[PDB]
């Protein structure tokens, strides 16, 4: 049963060469048939130790409570993986033909891969939550557009909404370029393009409403623009959270 495609291009670039080399090793094990592996194992231990260290600093100094809960079990997984690598090297010094040593090199390798994957994904989910909080900020501020009655309110509204929109567009653009799923990139870009092209429509609509206060047409055109922008933003929030069983 096939291993899924990695979630983003960054994670892919880091983990794919590992995943492939392990597959090669497994094939060697199942098919056909040795220097002292004590030093390169120690190098892996060192690397993993440093990773866990940086991970702990990230955990202690973050404000994402979900990230605090989900990341630390990845530390345990990779440290446990290193243990198997250490045992494998020790076994091989005793017997270069050791089969359990081979199973350990494979299991330990997979453990590091699986754990490094968990750590990367859990951080990626935290990065996504930041984008979502911004998007939901826009949604909340789109509802207060129905409160703007005076021209000075409109000036204050636009000055607050404007930079919020620009930030959201930058985040979505940066995020779409990282996805390994093309349909998701398309849905994100199409939705964001619609939102940006409805922004001047929304501003002009309530400008008419403010000045006219034919208010009925301007009233409804404003509302319809809001609810359409909101619909598009909600669509973005969903696509951002997509790991397809959907």
């Amino acid at each position: 049963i096939q291993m899924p495609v990695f979630h983003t291009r960054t994670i892919e670039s880091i983990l794919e060469p590992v995943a492939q080399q392990i597959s090669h090793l497994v094939i060697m094990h199942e098919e056909g048939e040795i220097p002292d592996l004590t030093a390169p194992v120690s190098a892996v231990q060192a690397a993993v130790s440093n990773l866990v260290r940086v991970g702990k600093e990230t955990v202690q100094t973050t404000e994402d409570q979900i990230l605090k809960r989900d990341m630390p079990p990845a530390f345990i997984k990779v440290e446990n993986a290193c243990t198997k690598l250490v045992r494998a090297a020790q076994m091989l010094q005793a017997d270069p033909y050791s089969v359990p040593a081979r199973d350990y090199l494979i299991d330990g390798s997979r453990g590091i891969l699986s754990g490094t994957s968990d750590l990367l994904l859990t951080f990626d989910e935290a990065e996504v939550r930041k984008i979502i909080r911004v998007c939901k900020g826009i949604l909340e501020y789109l509802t207060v557009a129905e409160v703007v009655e005076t021209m000075e309110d409109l000036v204050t509204y636009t000055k607050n909404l404007g930079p919020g929109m620009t930030k959201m567009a930058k985040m979505i653009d940066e995020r779409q370029q990282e996805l390994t799923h093309q349909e998701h990139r398309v849905m994100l870009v199409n939705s964001m393009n619609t939102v940006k092209e409805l922004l001047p429509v929304l501003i002009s609509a309530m400008k008419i409403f403010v000045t006219t206060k034919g208010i009925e047409e301007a009233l409804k055109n404003r509302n319809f623009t809001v609810e359409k922008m909101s619909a598009e933003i909600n669509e973005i929030i969903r696509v951002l959270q997509l790991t397809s069983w959907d």
């Binding site: 960054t10 880091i14 983990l15 060469p17 590992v18 080399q21 392990i22 090669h24 090793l25 060697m28 040795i34 220097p35 592996l37 390169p40 194992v41 190098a43 892996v44 060192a46 690397a47 993993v48 440093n50 990773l51 940086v54 991970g55 990230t58 990779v78 690598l85 090199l105 390798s109 590091i112 891969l113 490094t116 750590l119 990367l120 951080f123 990065e127």
Partner: peptide, 28 residues
Amino acid sequence: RDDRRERIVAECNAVRQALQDLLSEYMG
């Protein structure tokens, strides 16, 4: 820009590098 992200990616790459070196030494 996102230095917290960069630091994590760098550490994971260092883990990748050491593991690949280990596996390469074994596979020849």
